[PDB]
Structure formats: C-alpha cells, structure tokens
Amino acid sequence: SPILPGAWLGMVGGGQLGRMFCFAAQAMGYRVAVLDPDPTSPAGAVADKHLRAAYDDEAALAELAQLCDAVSTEVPAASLDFLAQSTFVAPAGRCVAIAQDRIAEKRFIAASGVPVAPHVVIESAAQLAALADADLAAVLPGILKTARKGQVRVATAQEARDAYGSLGGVPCVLEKRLPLKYEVSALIARGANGASAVFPLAQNTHHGGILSLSVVPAPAASDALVRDAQQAAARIADSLDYVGVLCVEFFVLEDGSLVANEMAPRPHNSGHYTVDACETSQFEQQVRAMTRLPLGSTRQHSPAAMLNVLGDVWFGEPVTPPWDQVAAMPTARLHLYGKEEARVGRKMGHVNFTAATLDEAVAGATACARLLRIPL
Template identity: 60%
Template sequence: MNTPLLPGAALGVMGGGQLGRMFVHAAQTMGYRTVVLEPDATSPAGLVAHQHVAAAYTDAAGLAELAASCDAVTTEFENVPADSLRTLAERVPVAPAAAAVEICQDRAAEKRHFQRSGVPCAPFATIETEADLAAAAGLLPGILKTARLGYDGKGQASVATADELAAAWQRLGRATCVLEKRLPLALELSVIVARGRDGALVHLPVQQNLHRDGILAVTQVPAPGVSPGLAAQAIDCAGRLAASMDYVGVLCVEFFVLADGSLVANEMAPRPHNSGHYSLDSCDVSQFELQLRTLAGLPLAAPRLHSAAVMLNLLGDLWFPGETSEPRTPDWAGVLALPGVALHLYGKTDARRGRKMGHLTVTAADAAGARATALRVCERLGLPAF
C-alpha cells in the first residue's frame, strides 16, 4: 500500500468483541466505513459496524465478502486463524500480518522470539511428551501454560513438584505446554507501541497493571512503581520486538518487574490491549486511533498523556453482588457523580461472572487525585481496593 487510505475508505476487522467495537468507533469518528467479520449475530463490534459479515473466521465465502467490502483489514484478537489472514492478504492489505500473529498465538514460539530478539524472559521449557516433564523438573516451582488459546488465567496451573506438574499436564489434556520458572515479582507493567509500514514507531506511556485471578483489574498511568530508566528499557524492548517481526499495527508487550528490579517479558498481544483502554480518556491519541493510523497508512503522531488515569475493569460479577442469582444493575449513577469518571460498557447482551463487561476510567490532574477517586469508585461498586 503506497498511498494512505483516507476517510471514506472501508476498514475491515476480523473479530466482533469489545476491541473491535472500540476500533469501529474510532474509525467512524474519523469518517471511515467499517466492516466486521464475526459469526455471532449480536457481537459488540458487529452491532455498531456499517456492515456485519456473519461468518466463521475460516469461511471462504465470508472472507471473500470481507475482502471485497473493504480496503484493508486488521484483527481484534490473536486467535484469528493465521491462514485466514494470509487468504485476505492476497486481496487487501492486512495489518498485523499473519506471520506476526502466528508468533503471538503460540507461547513457545513467543518465548523463542523473545530470546532471538535479545529480550529477557523467564526460564522456560516446552512440554510435548512425558520425557519433557522429567527434563523440565529443574524449573520447578513454576507455571504450566497451554502453548495455545489460554487467556485471562485460563489454561494454566501453578505447580511446585514433579507430581503436580505431571497431574496438571494431564488436566490440560496433554496439550503442548510451556513451563515457566516462577520468579519473585514486584509488579507488572505493559507497553503499547504502534509501528507503521515505514518503520515509524510511537508508544503510549508505560502502564502499571494489577491482575486478580489472572484477569486485569487495575491499570495506573503514570506507573507509580516504575522509574524512568525502567520505563525506557520496557519501551526499547517492545520496539525491538515489533521491529524484529517487521510488525505493522498496535502491539502490547506485558512485562514482569522482579524483586531485584530487573525486567522480563511475559507475553505479547498483536492488537490493542485491555491495559490501554485508559488512552480513550487520558491521551490525545488513543490506542484504537493508532490501530487505525497504522492500518490506513496515516502518519503516526506520538500520543500525549494529558491526564493521570486509573482504569478499572468491570466484570460480570458486579451484576451479581453476594449470593445474588439474578443480575442487578450496578450503581452507575453513584459512580458517575464522582469527578473525572468515564463509563465504557461493551454492549454485551448478558452479564456473566468473570466476563469483561466494560471498564471505568478515572482521570485527574495528578496521579494521587486519580487514585483517590478510583478508590471511591471501588467502594461504591464493592470492588476491592488497590
């Protein structure tokens, strides 16, 4: 693609979840037509796009319709079949490319890519056979994760002994897994970069994250526990990973900061990320506008943080306080009465425990003010403090 796609062009999305929905909103704000391929007739993104191609991600007719309906295609989640992206790329520009998405789909391939790129990660071993279990015992205690399809804490188990490792591998269906050595963690952070076809690279501020039960709960920006030097190191590592894949699009790299202050990469997401949602309210260019700019070949303006922010994930559990079996609407009026609170709900038709239903962003002139208001939000909604 030698010339930018300007407003009026049609941009396609593989996947109909909330990330696709927020991309569609960003594209429509800038005057683009949007097309979503997603099998679910009531998907968050499909409901708001100009055109919804209701088909499976591998459906040849659906892929042909998507390619014929738009000028470029992106993906909103990493588990879109890479072969489908290759098929689309024969007809229209696709960003990110199938080869990069394929690396992020497989934890073992991802870890090897970290090593090739000179980015530190936890010691690991790939488990494919019973013989691999014995060979990996030196990494215990550790975390056993399926190489593919696990997310939000699913498809993984904490193991301390060889017997626990063998039992966990059996529970995971003897699928190919990665065993990562457990390291002493101080905190978690993430970096979101956007890379254009010309190699231009910009990034959002470093984000400090808190997970509960494997699911992101809180993101704080500026990151309170991250020094400028550590932030620069994380940004450099993320940029190096993007360049090494000749990546085009938005890429999130999650890191662990160890007790000794060193940094190790955890995983990558070839798309916008939950930890970057605050950028909709606290940056002049959001992660979704960056995704649009990289896809359309527009110039990449470096995002500027104009407000400190705290992002709170809203899971379906909020609709079921205590032992409630029937869903109840959370106290939106109460939290929206607080200054600097923005509510984002994803248009999902039913609330379920553990399901990501939306997020709240609290902005303020400084980090202390954003945190104080966010703690008041937690109190009113019954969320744990942080």
C-alpha cells in the same frame, strides 16, 4: 501509499474491542466491515457491514478482502494469510501466529534481546518422556501453560507430568515462577514505514487472572525502567516487522529486573485509558497503522487510571450498580458495554479516571472500587 477516509476497513473479530475500533475508524471517516460469527456481535451492530460468518469461511473472507482496502483484527492465521493474498492485513498473519503461541513468543521475544522467564518447552508426550524429572525440576515451582486458562500451577516433576497429560498432549511450555514485585505493560504502535509511537507505561494488577486496575504513568517504575520497557516493546515490533498496535506485558521482579510475560497483537484492556488520557487512542493508532497514515501523538494530557467492571459487581439476582454515585465523581469516565446479562468473570465495562494529578486519578479509582465492591 496511504488509504484515505472513505475507504472500507475490515475487522476480523467482533467483541467490545472491535466495537471500539469501529468507533475510531468511523470517527476518521472510514467505512467498517466486521467479520464475526456471533449474530449479536457488538462490533457488527455498529459496523457499516456485518459479515455473519465463521472465521474460516472462505466465501466470507473473499467478500471481506474484496470490499476492504485494509483488514485488522482484535483468529486463525490462515484466515489472515488468505485475506493477505488480496488486501493489506495489519498485523500480518505471521505476527498474529507468533503472538498467539506461547512457545513462539518465548523464541521471538528473546531473539529481540528481551528477557523472558526460565522455561522448558514440552512439544509432545514424546518430548515430555525424554525430559527427566531433574529437567522439569530446573524450572519448578512453575506453571505449565498450553502454547495455544489452560494453565496449571505445578511444584514437582510428577505434578508437571500429570498436568501435561491433563491438557491433552498439546504443545506446552513450563515456565518457572519468579519473585514478582509488580506488573507493567507497554503499548506501542509501529507503521509499515518503521515509524513507532509509544505510550506511557501502565502499572497493572490482576485478580483471578483478570485485569483489575491500570495506573498510568506507572507509579513504581523509575525513568530507566520505563525506557527499558518501552524500548523492549519497540525492539520486538521492529524485529518482527510488526505493523499495528502491540501490547507487551511484563513482570518487574523483587531485584528490579524486567521480564516479558506475554504480548497481544492488538489494542489491549490495559490501554483503554488512552481514550480519555492521551491525544490519540490505541484504537486510532490501529486505524492509522493499517491505513499507512502517520501515527498519532501519544502525549498523555492527563494522569489516569482504569478500573475493569465485571459482572461480579451486580451480585443471587442481578442488581444495577449505583452508577449515579460513580457519575458524581469528577474523575470518572464511564465506558459501559450495554450487555444484557451480568455474569461473574464477564467484562461489563470499564471506568477511566483522569485528573490534573495522578494522586487525584488514583483516589477516584480507589473510591469507585470501594463503592462498586471491586477488589484491589
């Protein structure tokens, strides 16, 4: 039964993505309650109600579940399950619990018939001690990552062991480094009735572990590769009975293989382009999935790219970037977060670039990046 406009929707989490969700929900006539302990919550600021409380505050959770016909997130899975005792929660705590845990991700993604990188799970110091040097070496060189940037690049058994001790004896996964050619992400929505809507494939670059540029449709990817990555994302959502928006990031290797890297159980930075390029944005899809409305059209009307703008662009004292010169660019769509303080590494906004042709969109992104001194 669909949850119609006029209902209250809840959002657990109140950063910029929550604020984007609030816009999309309110534009469809829903009321939005945000749960977020931050008194300066950007999403709380724009919401019809801001519950300023911890994510594990049972009184606040109980108030959110009473008020809201459905709840989503942008969190402890136990808070989700607590809410789901009383209201509809999409994506479900189980799905968030999986996506959140790199060991679980490996297990459930493989069980959906999707390749993952070679890896050795290291649950505890005891298991590490049982693993021989030669066992660790089978996935080296690699990166040791905590299951829950707790990542250390390692090249020898001893380096792996020292890294593991350094991360505190928590569950980890040791992942083999593969010969990466380029990265892509698939962005899909799945409804409670099993219907699916999938966006075009994004091609993504990162610097310092942070997304820099997305280009859509992915220029390097064959039709075949696009189908495989879209299908892989659908398979995971279907296998998990996922309700909501899911972003699956992949590596494409030098030999052309597709390998799933990580998944986010929510709208994702690599999907911001959808607001300006597609018929339905990723945030409207989150609204539709959680309300059991029909999913929206994912038609991409305009070739697109997206550039992240970090606080780096303001730098010793902050200097306002030349936004007038960006706005002169006919392809540029400004999304600036209105944050008081520029800081290195902090997402201050993004700029989407849309045009009749992808070459025009990419040229705008490139010109903008040169203007703002954003590394590509």
